[PDB]
Short mmCIF file of C-alpha atoms and ligand atoms in Angstrom, two decimals:
data_model
loop_
_atom_site.label_atom_id
_atom_site.label_comp_id
_atom_site.label_asym_id
_atom_site.label_seq_id
_atom_site.Cartn_x
_atom_site.Cartn_y
_atom_site.Cartn_z
CA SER A 1 -0.14 -0.15 -0.65
CA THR A 2 0.94 3.21 0.23
CA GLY A 3 -0.52 7.24 0.18
CA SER A 4 -0.55 10.87 -0.25
CA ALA A 5 -1.40 13.69 2.27
CA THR A 6 -0.94 17.28 0.75
CA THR A 7 0.93 19.80 3.44
CA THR A 8 -0.50 23.06 3.63
CA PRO A 9 1.78 25.93 6.38
CA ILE A 10 -0.42 27.94 7.93
CA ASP A 11 0.07 31.69 7.52
CA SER A 12 2.35 33.18 5.29
CA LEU A 13 5.48 33.44 6.92
CA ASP A 14 5.00 28.68 7.19
CA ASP A 15 5.20 28.80 10.13
CA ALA A 16 3.32 25.05 10.60
CA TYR A 17 2.31 23.09 8.11
CA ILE A 18 -1.76 21.20 8.03
CA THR A 19 -2.40 17.63 6.66
CA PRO A 20 -5.53 16.38 6.57
CA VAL A 21 -5.88 13.23 8.36
CA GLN A 22 -9.72 10.84 8.47
CA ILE A 23 -10.40 9.30 11.72
CA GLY A 24 -13.38 7.55 12.38
CA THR A 25 -16.63 5.91 10.65
CA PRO A 26 -18.05 7.50 9.82
CA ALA A 27 -14.60 10.05 8.44
CA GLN A 28 -14.48 13.20 10.63
CA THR A 29 -11.17 15.39 8.65
CA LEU A 30 -8.87 16.27 11.24
CA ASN A 31 -6.32 18.74 10.69
CA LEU A 32 -2.75 18.03 12.09
CA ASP A 33 1.05 18.73 11.71
CA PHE A 34 3.18 16.35 11.26
CA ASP A 35 5.99 15.92 13.57
CA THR A 36 9.22 14.17 12.75
CA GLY A 37 10.13 15.31 16.49
CA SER A 38 7.57 13.45 18.30
CA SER A 39 5.80 9.60 18.87
CA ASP A 40 2.23 10.78 20.39
CA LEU A 41 -0.65 11.72 16.84
CA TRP A 42 -3.14 13.71 19.91
CA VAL A 43 -5.99 15.45 18.78
CA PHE A 44 -8.46 18.60 19.84
CA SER A 45 -11.56 16.46 21.20
CA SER A 46 -15.42 16.74 23.03
CA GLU A 47 -13.11 16.13 25.66
CA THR A 48 -10.64 18.75 25.95
CA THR A 49 -12.02 21.73 28.37
CA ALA A 50 -14.20 24.27 26.38
CA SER A 51 -11.85 27.16 27.31
CA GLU A 52 -9.22 25.24 25.57
CA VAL A 53 -11.12 25.22 22.61
CA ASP A 54 -11.19 28.43 20.02
CA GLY A 55 -12.13 27.56 16.83
CA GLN A 56 -10.28 24.06 16.35
CA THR A 57 -11.63 20.64 14.29
CA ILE A 58 -12.96 17.97 16.81
CA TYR A 59 -12.71 14.92 17.14
CA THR A 60 -15.83 13.12 18.90
CA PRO A 61 -14.93 9.14 19.96
CA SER A 62 -19.42 8.55 20.76
CA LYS A 63 -19.60 9.38 16.86
CA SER A 64 -16.93 6.62 15.58
CA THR A 65 -18.86 3.33 15.25
CA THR A 66 -14.79 1.40 15.48
CA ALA A 67 -13.52 3.89 18.30
CA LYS A 68 -13.09 1.64 21.19
CA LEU A 69 -11.78 2.98 24.36
CA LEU A 70 -7.71 2.58 25.49
CA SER A 71 -8.75 1.29 29.11
CA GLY A 72 -6.71 2.86 31.24
CA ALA A 73 -4.20 4.98 29.55
CA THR A 74 -3.20 8.10 29.54
CA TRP A 75 -0.56 10.24 28.04
CA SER A 76 0.95 13.85 28.66
CA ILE A 77 3.31 15.21 26.62
CA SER A 78 6.09 18.62 26.93
CA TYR A 79 7.65 19.52 23.50
CA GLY A 80 10.95 21.89 22.83
CA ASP A 81 8.50 25.30 22.60
CA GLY A 82 7.23 24.82 26.18
CA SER A 83 3.53 23.87 25.18
CA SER A 84 2.07 20.72 26.10
CA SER A 85 -0.88 18.29 25.86
CA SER A 86 -2.35 15.50 27.74
CA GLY A 87 -5.34 13.08 28.23
CA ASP A 88 -6.93 9.41 28.01
CA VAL A 89 -6.83 7.40 24.36
CA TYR A 90 -8.51 5.50 21.90
CA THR A 91 -8.23 3.25 18.98
CA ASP A 92 -9.70 3.75 15.80
CA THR A 93 -9.19 3.91 12.26
CA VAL A 94 -6.20 6.01 11.25
CA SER A 95 -6.41 6.82 7.68
CA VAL A 96 -3.51 9.56 5.68
CA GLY A 97 -3.47 10.31 1.48
CA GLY A 98 -5.51 7.08 1.28
CA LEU A 99 -3.57 5.10 3.80
CA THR A 100 -5.73 3.59 6.23
CA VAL A 101 -4.25 1.48 10.00
CA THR A 102 -6.92 0.19 11.63
CA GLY A 103 -6.41 0.11 15.63
CA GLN A 104 -4.05 3.30 15.70
CA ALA A 105 -4.14 5.12 18.98
CA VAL A 106 -5.14 8.68 19.20
CA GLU A 107 -4.91 10.28 22.11
CA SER A 108 -7.82 12.99 22.91
CA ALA A 109 -6.74 16.31 25.27
CA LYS A 110 -7.67 17.30 27.93
CA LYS A 111 -5.98 19.66 28.71
CA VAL A 112 -4.40 21.47 26.52
CA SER A 113 -1.73 24.45 26.99
CA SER A 114 -2.48 27.95 25.66
CA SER A 115 -0.31 28.18 22.41
CA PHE A 116 -2.43 24.94 21.15
CA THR A 117 -6.33 27.42 22.24
CA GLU A 118 -4.40 30.64 20.43
CA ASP A 119 -3.17 28.45 16.98
CA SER A 120 -7.38 27.43 15.47
CA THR A 121 -6.01 26.10 12.30
CA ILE A 122 -4.24 22.66 14.05
CA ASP A 123 -5.62 19.90 15.02
CA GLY A 124 -3.27 18.34 16.89
CA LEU A 125 -0.26 16.61 16.23
CA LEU A 126 0.79 12.78 14.63
CA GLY A 127 3.82 11.75 15.34
CA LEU A 128 6.83 9.92 12.83
CA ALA A 129 9.75 9.90 15.08
CA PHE A 130 10.24 6.55 16.76
CA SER A 131 8.33 4.97 18.58
CA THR A 132 10.17 4.59 21.72
CA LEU A 133 8.62 8.16 22.82
CA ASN A 134 5.42 7.66 23.03
CA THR A 135 4.00 8.93 25.73
CA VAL A 136 0.92 6.39 26.34
CA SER A 137 1.74 5.37 29.56
CA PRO A 138 0.68 2.14 30.87
CA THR A 139 1.25 0.40 27.47
CA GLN A 140 3.20 2.04 25.02
CA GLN A 141 1.99 3.14 20.86
CA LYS A 142 3.29 2.71 18.48
CA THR A 143 3.57 5.53 15.34
CA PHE A 144 1.24 5.92 12.09
CA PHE A 145 4.46 4.97 10.89
CA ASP A 146 5.69 2.16 12.85
CA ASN A 147 1.95 0.34 12.36
CA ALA A 148 1.62 1.09 8.71
CA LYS A 149 5.22 -0.08 7.39
CA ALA A 150 4.46 -3.44 6.87
CA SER A 151 2.15 -2.69 4.68
CA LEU A 152 3.65 -0.18 3.17
CA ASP A 153 5.68 -1.18 -0.45
CA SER A 154 8.82 0.47 0.68
CA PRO A 155 9.34 1.31 4.19
CA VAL A 156 9.55 5.30 3.79
CA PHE A 157 7.76 8.11 4.15
CA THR A 158 8.81 11.82 2.57
CA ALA A 159 8.90 14.86 3.09
CA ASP A 160 8.84 17.83 0.09
CA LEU A 161 7.49 20.42 2.75
CA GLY A 162 7.00 23.92 0.32
CA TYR A 163 8.36 27.74 0.22
CA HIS A 164 5.35 29.60 1.01
CA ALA A 165 3.20 26.80 -1.07
CA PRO A 166 1.90 22.93 -0.41
CA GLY A 167 3.86 19.76 -0.32
CA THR A 168 3.47 16.81 0.04
CA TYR A 169 4.09 13.94 2.61
CA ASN A 170 4.37 10.26 0.23
CA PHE A 171 3.60 6.93 2.28
CA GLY A 172 5.50 3.92 1.09
CA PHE A 173 7.37 4.84 -2.06
CA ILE A 174 9.90 7.27 -3.30
CA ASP A 175 8.10 9.87 -6.16
CA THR A 176 11.24 10.03 -8.09
CA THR A 177 9.75 13.57 -10.15
CA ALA A 178 9.46 14.85 -7.05
CA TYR A 179 13.42 15.70 -6.93
CA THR A 180 17.01 16.82 -8.67
CA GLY A 181 19.75 14.60 -9.15
CA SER A 182 20.15 12.34 -7.03
CA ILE A 183 18.72 11.20 -3.38
CA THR A 184 22.22 10.96 -1.01
CA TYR A 185 21.43 8.79 2.21
CA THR A 186 22.91 9.53 5.39
CA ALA A 187 23.15 6.96 8.83
CA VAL A 188 21.33 7.92 11.17
CA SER A 189 21.01 6.99 15.50
CA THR A 190 17.62 6.64 17.60
CA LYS A 191 19.77 6.31 19.71
CA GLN A 192 17.14 9.43 21.11
CA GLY A 193 14.00 8.71 19.38
CA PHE A 194 15.29 11.53 16.72
CA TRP A 195 15.59 11.18 12.70
CA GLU A 196 19.30 11.97 14.41
CA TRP A 197 22.36 12.88 11.24
CA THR A 198 25.38 14.67 10.80
CA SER A 199 25.89 16.48 8.82
CA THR A 200 28.99 17.42 7.28
CA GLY A 201 29.34 21.50 7.34
CA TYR A 202 27.95 24.26 5.63
CA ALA A 203 28.30 27.58 3.82
CA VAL A 204 27.26 31.44 3.54
CA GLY A 205 26.05 32.35 0.87
CA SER A 206 29.18 32.12 -2.38
CA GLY A 207 31.41 31.54 0.89
CA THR A 208 34.21 28.41 0.90
CA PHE A 209 32.35 25.31 2.70
CA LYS A 210 33.22 24.88 6.29
CA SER A 211 33.96 20.65 7.23
CA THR A 212 32.86 20.07 10.40
CA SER A 213 30.94 17.78 12.17
CA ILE A 214 27.13 19.14 13.09
CA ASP A 215 25.04 15.80 14.42
CA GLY A 216 21.83 16.92 14.67
CA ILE A 217 17.89 15.68 14.50
CA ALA A 218 15.39 16.90 10.94
CA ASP A 219 11.88 17.98 13.23
CA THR A 220 9.23 18.82 10.53
CA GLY A 221 7.69 19.28 13.91
CA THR A 222 9.82 22.84 14.57
CA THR A 223 9.41 26.07 12.52
CA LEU A 224 13.43 27.25 12.97
CA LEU A 225 16.64 25.58 11.64
CA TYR A 226 18.46 25.57 15.34
CA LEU A 227 22.62 24.71 14.83
CA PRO A 228 25.72 26.19 17.07
CA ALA A 229 26.36 29.27 18.00
CA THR A 230 29.80 29.77 16.22
CA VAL A 231 28.10 28.96 13.45
CA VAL A 232 24.58 31.29 13.45
CA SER A 233 27.59 33.97 14.81
CA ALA A 234 29.53 32.95 11.00
CA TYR A 235 25.33 32.98 9.14
CA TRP A 236 24.68 36.55 10.84
CA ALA A 237 27.79 38.60 10.43
CA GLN A 238 27.03 38.97 7.05
CA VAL A 239 24.05 40.52 6.72
CA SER A 240 24.34 44.42 8.16
CA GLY A 241 23.05 45.32 11.36
CA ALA A 242 21.90 41.93 12.37
CA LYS A 243 22.52 41.06 16.28
CA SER A 244 21.24 38.61 18.33
CA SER A 245 18.82 40.54 20.48
CA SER A 246 17.77 39.18 24.61
CA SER A 247 14.37 41.10 24.74
CA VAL A 248 13.38 39.41 21.09
CA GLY A 249 14.65 35.99 21.76
CA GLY A 250 17.31 35.70 19.27
CA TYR A 251 18.59 37.30 15.83
CA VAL A 252 17.63 39.93 14.10
CA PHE A 253 18.41 41.93 11.46
CA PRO A 254 16.57 44.69 9.15
CA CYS A 255 13.98 44.20 7.07
CA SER A 256 15.40 46.65 4.15
CA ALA A 257 18.20 43.36 4.25
CA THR A 258 18.85 40.73 1.29
CA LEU A 259 20.03 37.77 2.94
CA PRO A 260 22.47 35.68 2.18
CA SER A 261 21.93 31.18 1.22
CA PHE A 262 22.88 28.78 3.82
CA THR A 263 24.64 25.56 2.56
CA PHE A 264 24.45 22.45 4.40
CA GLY A 265 26.78 19.49 3.61
CA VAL A 266 24.75 15.41 3.37
CA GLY A 267 27.49 13.22 3.00
CA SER A 268 29.52 14.94 -0.09
CA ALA A 269 26.29 16.65 -0.96
CA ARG A 270 25.10 20.70 -0.30
CA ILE A 271 21.50 21.56 0.07
CA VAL A 272 21.06 25.28 -0.45
CA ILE A 273 18.69 27.49 1.22
CA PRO A 274 17.97 30.27 -0.32
CA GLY A 275 18.20 33.79 1.62
CA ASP A 276 14.27 34.37 1.48
CA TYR A 277 13.49 31.15 3.38
CA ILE A 278 15.64 32.89 6.06
CA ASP A 279 12.86 36.25 6.35
CA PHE A 280 10.40 35.64 9.23
CA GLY A 281 9.48 38.66 9.20
CA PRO A 282 8.38 41.60 11.63
CA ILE A 283 8.85 40.73 15.16
CA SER A 284 5.84 42.40 15.89
CA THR A 285 3.77 43.68 13.03
CA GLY A 286 4.83 47.23 11.92
CA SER A 287 8.49 47.02 12.53
CA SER A 288 11.28 46.90 10.17
CA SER A 289 12.99 44.51 12.69
CA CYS A 290 12.73 41.39 11.31
CA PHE A 291 12.98 37.38 12.22
CA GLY A 292 15.99 35.19 11.71
CA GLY A 293 14.92 32.03 10.65
CA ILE A 294 18.34 30.88 11.46
CA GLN A 295 19.01 31.07 15.65
CA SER A 296 22.05 29.23 18.12
CA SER A 297 20.27 25.85 19.81
CA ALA A 298 22.99 26.80 23.19
CA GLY A 299 20.64 26.24 25.64
CA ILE A 300 18.20 23.31 24.29
CA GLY A 301 20.94 20.87 23.79
CA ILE A 302 20.55 19.55 20.15
CA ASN A 303 20.72 20.77 16.58
CA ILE A 304 17.24 20.71 14.52
CA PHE A 305 16.90 20.47 10.84
CA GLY A 306 13.51 22.32 11.44
CA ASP A 307 11.68 23.38 8.39
CA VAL A 308 13.67 26.22 7.07
CA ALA A 309 16.08 23.30 6.15
CA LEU A 310 13.51 20.35 5.22
CA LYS A 311 11.36 22.19 3.17
CA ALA A 312 14.60 23.53 0.87
CA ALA A 313 15.73 19.91 0.22
CA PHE A 314 13.30 15.20 -1.02
CA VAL A 315 14.15 14.51 2.31
CA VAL A 316 13.27 10.80 2.95
CA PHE A 317 12.83 9.26 6.32
CA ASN A 318 13.87 4.89 5.64
CA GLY A 319 12.40 3.40 8.42
CA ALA A 320 13.90 0.40 7.15
CA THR A 321 15.69 -2.34 10.08
CA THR A 322 19.17 0.47 9.95
CA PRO A 323 17.25 2.73 9.46
CA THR A 324 18.56 6.42 7.58
CA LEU A 325 17.96 9.72 6.02
CA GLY A 326 17.84 10.62 2.37
CA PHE A 327 18.29 14.31 0.73
CA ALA A 328 18.29 15.73 -2.73
CA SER A 329 17.99 19.41 -4.36
CA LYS A 330 14.00 19.81 -5.69
NA1 NA B 401 8.57 33.62 17.22
#
């Protein structure tokens, strides 16, 4: 089997991407944030505290003829940005882009933090990191990908995120029409539960390539590119008037600037992030200070290849017995 779904930016900045997911019988379609950095499929629901729901579509298990309470199971998750959610668990039929899993754990939120309530466009998360990170207790649950894997034509999914445009998530096949040149595959460590790999270095604009190992994670659920402070300082030094602002919470630059590109290595291959991808617009409405898309990972304890980097590539998440990542230009 295969599946193929379109993923759509939630706003003009590509702050996140939503993908429609069918849950239950008859189908209830919710718009979920596919997150390769976490392993829970959770939704706004009929159980979510009413004051914490503001415009999201909800899952109502009582209206699904295939929903069953997973008796005694609870979940609770905290993300890198400080947001959180928790609740109880149903099993139900879940379909993505024509690919169906029966008996998927659907984690129903009883509580969500303020950042989730305030985002009316995201109805929940669909985790695509390794199932070792799933938070369900006392019986840990499998991701949608791990439950689908054995049925797929190939044990893979691909992320093809757009810049200010829709893109695609495919399950079970490589679309050889969706990229240019060849795919370069690189080793993955699953020791922290992430799609963790080692970049071979970087360049700023038309500058020389610096060969250096950068360990980090491929995370579709993180908006920005978070790298070591040395690499980030080297990038923003090439932008007149850029500075790190403790008051704003990262590097800002004059909105009048033209940003240089950023290149990262994948083995002997190179992925080029155009400068435009690194502009996240005014810090507040009408400001002439703009927020950068490359930020320091110092204090986060890991480097994160988030959407700014991933949407410059066609990305293969190879879930074979020894997992690997693949990157191609597009
Ligand atoms: Na922000």
